[PDB]
Design a binder for this molecule. Structure first.
Ligand SMILES: Cc1cc(=O)oc2c(CN(C)C)c(O)ccc12
Ligand code: NI
Length: 341
């Protein structure tokens, strides 16, 4: 059954609540983004209204075959009335099509649901600048000060420079990038752009990228693997055995693989600056773990919440243990006492 932190009180609305059957009293189901833990349960057999971004709607239609009559895309940064309640969708700076949702309740209460987000100072000049938020439903994925990582820009600079050096030294090297979901497309797009190549991938992954409204996409991606020296593979194949196997299939075009595994945070972020990152190597294969995050760092999250000054915070991640819950509650109180709200 549907948990309390996925319900929006005083409305008929739920958020990211498709795996619980028919939810009692739910007249409209919101979907913040197309990641599997959030869409779990949606299919061609779903017959209630779904509200989401245009990009999320494209993915629902083409990947999950949800019927067009039930998909309700909304524009960003625009006041919309849904079942008698004013709502706004805001860019979440997560994966393509990901949104935060502002709900203006009939009783005067204002709720922000962040979905999954990477907090940024640019959000301080969205439609949030105006007004008071009474309740914040917060992506607390990395809510502890040990969680540090670089900017996305710094990580992409490292990846571009690393790939360009390797292929200029050896014109017969292949670059491989791992993926298991939408998000983090800049990693493979930036590498292909510096190398003058299209990105080669499966038919299934090509279909997914065609749903994302990325400008000039037809110029950047392909299903013709032989025409490309940047290949995308499933994340599970980014290991010495899987990469050895892939190199065999390329028909003696290549004699080296440089591979990237975009992760989130790992314990090596504790002690290794992005510039000092080194790969795991076996023979003619090297693998780089790069900390490309689409979730807020601790510091980014703290700045956002101290700016917004919500009256109450409801975490939506790390909710399952008493230790996690107590830790998060202690940080929220510190933030409030430091800033004075
Ligand atoms: C064939 C080959 C395999 C490999 O793993 O690395 C290479 C490098 C990179 N450093 C120097 C080892 C080259 O510069 C040139 C060729 C290769
Ligand atoms: Ni997500």
């Amino acid at each position: 059954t549907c948990p309390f932190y996925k319900k929006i009180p005083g409305t008929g609305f739920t958020v990211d609540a498709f795996q619980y059957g028919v939810v009692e009293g739910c007249t409209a189901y919101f979907l913040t983004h197309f990641h599997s833990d959030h869409y779990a349960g949606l299919s061609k057999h779903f017959t209630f209204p779904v509200y989401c971004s245009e990009i999320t709607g494209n993915l629902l239609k083409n990947k999950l075959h949800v019927q067009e009559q039930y998909i309700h895309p909304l524009p960003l940064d625009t006041e919309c009335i849904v079942n008698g309640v004013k709502v706004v969708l805001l860019d979440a700076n997560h994966c393509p099509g990901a949104v935060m949702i502002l709900f203006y309740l009939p009783n005067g209460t204002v709720i922000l649901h962040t979905g999954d987000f990477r907090a940024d100072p640019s959000m301080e000049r969205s439609l949030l600048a105006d007004q008071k938020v009474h309740m914040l439903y917060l992506d607390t994925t990395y809510c502890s000060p040990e969680y540090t990582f670089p900017s996305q820009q710094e990580v992409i600079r490292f990846a571009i420079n690393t790939a360009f050096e390797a292929v200029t030294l050896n014109p017969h090297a292949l670059v491989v990038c791992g993926t298991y979901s939408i998000g983090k497309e800049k990693v493979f797009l930036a590498i292909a752009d510096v190398l003058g190549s299209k990105v080669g991938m499966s038919q299934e992954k090509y279909k997914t990228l065609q749903c994302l409204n990325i400008p000039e996409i037809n110029s950047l991606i392909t299903t013709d693997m032989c025409s490309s020296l940047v290949h995308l593979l499933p994340m599970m194949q980014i290991n010495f055995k899987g990469l050895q196997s892939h190199l065999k299939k390329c028909g003696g075009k290549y004699n080296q693989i440089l591979a990237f595994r975009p992760t989130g945070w790992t314990h090596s972020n504790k002690f290794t600056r992005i510039a000092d990152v080194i790969p795991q190597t076996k023979g003619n294969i090297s693998i780089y773990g790069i900390p490309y995050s689409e979730h807020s760092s601790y510091l980014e999250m703290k700045r956002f919440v101290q700016w917004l000054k919500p009256q109450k915070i409801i975490p939506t991640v790390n909710v399952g243990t008493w230790k996690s819950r107590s830790t998060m509650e202690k940080y929220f109180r510190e933030w409030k006492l430091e800033a004075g709200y």
